[PDB]
Amino acid sequence: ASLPHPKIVKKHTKKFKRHHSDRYHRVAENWRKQKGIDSVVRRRFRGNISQPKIGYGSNKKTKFLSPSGHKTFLVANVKDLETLTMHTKTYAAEIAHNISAKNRVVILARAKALGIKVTNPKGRLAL
Template identity: 60%
Template sequence: MVSAKKHVPIVKKRTYNVHRCLAAKDDPCFSRFETTRLLGTKGMKELMSTTRFNRHQSDRFKCLSASWRKPKGIDNRVRRRFRGTMAMPSIGFGSNKKTRYMMPSGHKSFLVNNVKDVELLMMHNRTYAAEIASAVSSRKRIDIIARAKQLGVKVTNAKAKVTTEV
């Protein structure tokens, strides 16, 4: 007589999503450069992408701008979260912690008012990019840009108030 086989549960091998794997909290070696190496610049932008929330009925009426406003009506289907209606912004839609506040270049913005502020970025030139404040004069801008070039710091608005139109 043949004995019945013991029931052996089938264990599926866990496959990780690329984005989930990259955003793993337990990975101490994760860095922006590793992300771009794995996914390329297009993948970096994909990691940084955010959902656009439009105002309810902004597509119906021209007088309503598309910028998000929370619906407050007593019968509003979006506020009541009916199926098939647009999603309301919530904490779950927050951007990836690794790419939060990051520009498409992969740097985080740092506001600079003088040459001394640029020197703060000397050791962090791969993480932060200098952004010259709007109130800085064109003469000081030239000094800031020159110092940033020496230190290898990226300046996001290097051409502002420095170049002239022809």
């Protein structure tokens, strides 16, 4: 379960790619404000790409929540995970990208007995 939270509305789910992110390979797909005098993305014509702006902000009741309803939290070791014993169905653990496979089984065996949800239990499984 989770908290009783309203229906999670995500006003603009599409990613705000840069203008000409596709046409050139040098122009990366990270957003930059167009600043040309002649520019048509700053000037917000019809049929051109939509800009990020504060109107697309998310609801403060359902902000930072995963689609399971828990705020994620990076967990390196067992001592970080036991800071979530009080808060099991509010936060969810997430094991970092540099934890060895001898410690992930320890962290999962602890989070199972503490009921803390891990958002990536399938990382580095020794099948």
